[PDB]
């Protein structure tokens, strides 16, 4: 009983300090910048070959090779320049929700509803792609696999927890807990020592991979958070929920900086990504199109459109040369 | 394509495309169905020709040169709003109800879901003998206090069927009903008729006749 009141006064103190630190909104301080105008992107490539809905996609570190999983049980690796299928990996379970591409390009992990994170080896001496490891230990559907290195991978599940694995041993090295709902998405910081996870309890909290501690937590969303992406310099992140709103939280200030809501937007955000500079906040909605938000004034600086069904995944290359979108109509489109 | 290695890469890509097309052609013969219902309702014991293969459970029995894949979503124990859209393309929903309120709640939730507004439902009422033996011992009034009709088996079963169909509340959807016992073998035939009827209706809608 006393612990409940202690928690209540702790939350009150945290909120009071958080409001005390706030002096001016981002939209007020940066009001003097020239607008970026209208950013028109044209479809340069259209990657076809998938025969079912696409849930995930990841870009190679070299910004030329892709990876995508769909309901057909196929894991296809594309050549984003000449539109060629380098590999075609058949999954054991057709229910897959999260691709991941290794930073070194050697491995590609691909897990989903079947509760395990299958890890595939691309550079084999036999010339084929083999499942190097199959990581088990989660009691719920998997989401947003991310590679730290060639032998370290972070996973998120519907078990209201995130886990850090060791591919060599295959055991759950560290487990992060504290969420009260299904954890839907995570993104790894460029410094590669912290990561943030967006759960179904309308809250995203920052984690530490080394200590396994919840350093920070962020609130403000009215519904389940569906995607998260870090700011390029590793000091902010943008979240997307079914509330049809995007928000920009800052790790140093511990508060949301601005909101990216438009009156004409009804459906929520499925995927969130930034640009290389950190000025365009691209977000995918359920109304079949993506809106490019100028991340400093919250004005729609163009619309991608072009897709027939819901956009399920976004991807911005490391050099920023392209933006690739995947949707449920089994078509990937590359924009520039 | 000018180089030799790029020509070989293009040939490899074309071979992969051909393999993908063949696999997709071979992946259209099957029929994808969804199993649902309360626990201990016989949702895993419909057809004796089971041939299965924590997570998702697949059953791939075949009939009349047609492959039926039953995805039993049981055991997930998570929020259905986040993965139920993975089954948007299922031909039908097989709902199993044991007659011997929660089942009505699931049925209401699954029938009015935004993903399955046009997906027909095949409703199975299991354990006729158990229900008929239990109704004599206890009248159908403890769970349905609004009942007024006769306590006979036929009228009670029809009343339960009526309350299960009353939650439809949607056009472009049909509920196919069937009464099953433990010692029944023709469930495959009933599923085949329901699936072919659903396919006929979908083709009718696509052709523009209706």
């Amino acid at each position, epitope marked *: 009983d006393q612990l409940r009141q202690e928690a209540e006064q702790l939350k009150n103190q945290i909120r009071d300090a958080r409001k005390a630190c706030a002096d001016a909104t981002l939209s007020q301080i940066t009001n003097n910048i020239d607008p970026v105008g209208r950013i028109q992107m044209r479809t340069r490539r259209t990657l076809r070959g998938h025969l079912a809905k696409i849930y995930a996609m990841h870009w190679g570190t070299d910004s030329r090779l892709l990876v995508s999983a769909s309901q057909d049980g196929k894991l296809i690796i594309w050549d984003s320049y000449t539109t060629n299928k380098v590999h075609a990996i058949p999954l054991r379970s057709s229910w897959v929700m999260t691709c991941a591409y290794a930073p070194s*390009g050697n491995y590609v992990a691909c897990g989903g509803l079947d509760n395990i994170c299958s890890i595939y080896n691309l550079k084999t001496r036999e010339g084929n792609v083999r499942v190097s490891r199959e990581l088990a230990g989660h009691t719920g559907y998997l989401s947003c696999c991310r590679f730290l290195d060639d032998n370290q991978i972070v996973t998120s599940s519907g078990d209201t927890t995130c886990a850090l694995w060791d591919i060599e041993t295959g055991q759950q090295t560290t487990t992060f807990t504290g969420h009260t709902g299904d954890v839907m998405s995570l993104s790894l910081a460029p410094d590669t020592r912290l990561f943030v996870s967006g759960a179904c309890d309308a809250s995203a909290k920052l984690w530490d991979v080394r200590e396994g501690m919840c350093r920070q937590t962020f609130t403000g969303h009215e519904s389940d958070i569906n995607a998260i992406c870090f700011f390029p310099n590793g000091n902010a992140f943008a979240t997307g929920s079914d509330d049809a709103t995007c928000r920009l939280f800052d790790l140093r200030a511990d508060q949301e900086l601005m909101t990216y809501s438009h009156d004409n937007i009804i459906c929520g955000i499925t995927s969130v990504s930034f640009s290389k500079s950190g000025r365009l906040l691209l977000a995918g909605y359920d109304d079949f199109n993506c809106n490019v938000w100028d991340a400093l004034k919250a004005d729609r600086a163009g619309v991608l459109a072009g897709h027939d069904n819901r956009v399920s995944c976004l991807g911005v290359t490391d050099d920023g040369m392209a933006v690739a979108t995947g949707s449920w109509d089994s078509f990937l489109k590359i924009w520039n | 394509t*000018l180089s030799a*290695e790029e020509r070989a*890469a293009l*040939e*490899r890509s074309k071979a992969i495309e051909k393999n993908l097309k063949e696999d997709g052609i071979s992946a259209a013969k099957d029929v994808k169905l969804l199993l649902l219902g309360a626990d201990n309702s016989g949702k895993s014991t419909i057809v004796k020709q089971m041939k299965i293969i924590t997570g998702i459970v697949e059953t791939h029995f075949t009939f009349k040169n047609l492959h039926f894949r039953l995805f039993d979503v049981g055991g997930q124990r998570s929020e259905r709003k986040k993965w139920i859209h993975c089954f948007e393309d299922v031909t039908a929903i097989i709902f199993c109800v044991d007659l011997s309120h929660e089942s009505l709640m699931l049925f209401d939730s699954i029938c009015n879901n935004k993903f399955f507004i046009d997906t027909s439902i095949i409703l199975f009422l299991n354990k006729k003998d158990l229900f008929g033996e239990k109704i004599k011992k206890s009248p159908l009034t403890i769970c349905f206090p609004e009942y007024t009709g006769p306590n006979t088996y036929e009228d009670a079963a029809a009343y339960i069927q009526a309350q299960f169909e009353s939650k439809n509340r949607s056009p472009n959807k049909e509920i196919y009903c069937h009464m099953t016992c433990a010692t029944d073998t023709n469930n495959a035939q009933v599923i085949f008729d329901a699936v072919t009827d659903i396919i006929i209706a979908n083709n009718l809608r696509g052709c523009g006749l209706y």
Partner: single-chain antibody
Framework: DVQLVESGGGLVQPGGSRKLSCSAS????????MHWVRQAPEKGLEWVAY????????YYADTVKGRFTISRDDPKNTLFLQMTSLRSEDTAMYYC??????????????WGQGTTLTVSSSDIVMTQATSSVPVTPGESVSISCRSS???????????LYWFLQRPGQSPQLLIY???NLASGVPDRFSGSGSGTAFTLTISRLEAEDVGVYYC?????????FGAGTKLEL
């Protein structure tokens, strides 16, 4: 273990027909384009034939065009080579080489053990400046070979391959485009080049590194090898 072993060699009379079988075991045979490379006695390597994956595209050398026949048996994991008429110039040690082509692959990594065949009695020209170089261990060595055309394609990839043949063994790939190190070779190797002049350097040479170094172009068929530079100790 990847292993290519071939049989069918021996002494044959001129005008006869002989078939060589290259049996593969240890990799996905159906996904690898396979070549045939012959090495005349103390003369050097020379390309012969190539069959793509699935027997789609097949090429032949101008010397034996219309005279040899190459066939692929994917279920049996066997590669054949049928020759109709044999002259006295066909006597050589025939090698079987696998080649997989995609973005970032190593298309000459593994070579067969070699089979010896004896017979009783426009193109891109690659030239190697020196035929024999004596050197002591621990001293860096520079090997260079030129090409007639500029192998630097429009896509930025230069198709130059450097092979190493230890005495009594089969050639092994070291660098496949300009500096892309092969799988398992020591990191002391390094390669460079610009358009038509290319150089291979070996820092801290070891005693197991002596042999004959071949540079081959893959820009356009027929593939042509260099004269061959031999390291002496």
């Amino acid at each position: 273990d990847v292993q290519l072993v071939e049989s069918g060699g021996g002494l044959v009379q001129p005008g006869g027909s002989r078939k060589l079988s290259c049996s593969a075991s240890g990799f996905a045979f159906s996904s690898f384009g396979m070549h045939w490379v012959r090495q005349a006695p103390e003369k050097g390597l020379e390309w012969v034939a190539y069959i793509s994956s699935g027997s789609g595209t097949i090429y032949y050398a101008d010397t034996v065009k219309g005279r040899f026949t190459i066939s692929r048996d994917d279920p049996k994991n066997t590669l054949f080579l049928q020759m109709t008429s044999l002259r006295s110039e066909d006597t050589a040690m025939y090698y079987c080489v696998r080649s997989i082509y995609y973005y970032g692959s190593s298309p000459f990594d593994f070579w067969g053990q070699g089979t010896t065949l004896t017979v009783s009695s426009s193109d891109i020209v690659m030239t190697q400046a020196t035929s024999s170089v004596p050197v002591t261990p621990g001293e860096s060595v520079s090997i260079s070979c030129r090409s007639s055309k500029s192998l630097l394609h429009s896509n930025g990839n230069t198709y130059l391959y450097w092979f190493l043949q230890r005495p009594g063994q089969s050639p092994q790939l070291l660098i496949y485009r300009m500096s892309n190190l092969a799988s398992g070779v020591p990191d002391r190797f390094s390669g460079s080049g610009s358009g038509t002049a290319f150089t291979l350097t070996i820092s801290r040479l070891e005693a197991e590194d002596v042999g004959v170094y071949y540079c081959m172009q893959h820009l356009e068929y027929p593939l042509t090898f260099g004269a061959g530079t031999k390291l002496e100790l």
